[PDB]
Amino acid sequence: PDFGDHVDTSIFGQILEMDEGDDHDFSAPLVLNFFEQAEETFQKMETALNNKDLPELSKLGEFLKGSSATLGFTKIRDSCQLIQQYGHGLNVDGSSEPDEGVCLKKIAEALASARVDTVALHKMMREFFE
């Protein structure tokens, strides 16, 4: 399976080992569970944006970063890392960003990237598991 930059094959590959037989009896429910979880998190983020709660956004980013990391979903993990950082009021270089308005705008961009990358991956994973 050639998922491009979306998936770390060395990590995802280890998920696939847990399948007994060729029906993907373990990996497929797991991946499904991740997309549901992601979808829930994105909704809770979309609300957190609406209420301009930067700490919440930071934590949701960190949470979803961790679960995408576990499965090797690199592009999603990265965008969630940015949400974590911008939620703590920091730029990519580590310098502080004191303008909340700027932070929120950067989070919005990274949330859009995350959602789009999730959808892209969901499709490929659907092709893969059929």
Numbering used by the authors: 44 to 173
Show the paper's wording.
If the HK incorporates a REC domain (REC-1) is denoted as hybrid histidine kinase (hHK), and the first His-Asp phosphotransfer event occurs in the same polypeptide chain. Then, HPt protein containing a phosphorylatable His shuffles the phosphoryl group from the phosphorylatable Asp in the REC-1 domain to the phosphorylatable Asp in the REC domain of an RR (REC-2) in two more phosphotransfer steps. In fungi, the HPt accepts the phosphoryl group from REC-1 domains of various hHKs upstream of the signaling pathway and forwards it downstream to REC-2 domains present in at least two conserved RRs, Ssk1 and Skn7. Also, we have obtained the crystal structures of Ct_HPt alone and in complex with REChHK6 bound to the phosphomimetic BeF3−, as well as the crystal structures of REChHK3 and RECCa_Sln1.
To assess that phosphotransfer from REC-1 domains was being carried out on the phosphorylatable H105 of Ct_HPt, we generated the mutant H105E and conducted phosphotransfer experiments with REChHK6 and REChHK3 in the presence of PAM. The absence of electrophoretic mobility shift for the Ct_HPt mutant H105E in the presence of PAM, compared to WT, alone or upon incubation with the REC-1 domains indicated the absence of phosphotransfer and confirmed H105 as the only nucleophilic residue to become phosphorylated. We determined the structure of the phosphomutant Ct_HPt H105E at 2.4 Å which showed a similar structure than Ct_HPt in the complex (rmsd of 0.7 Å for 125 residues). However, the superposition of the phosphomutant to the complex showed few clashes with residues of REChHK6 involved in complex interactions, thus, supporting that subtle changes in the side chain conformation of a few residues could prevent phosphotransfer.
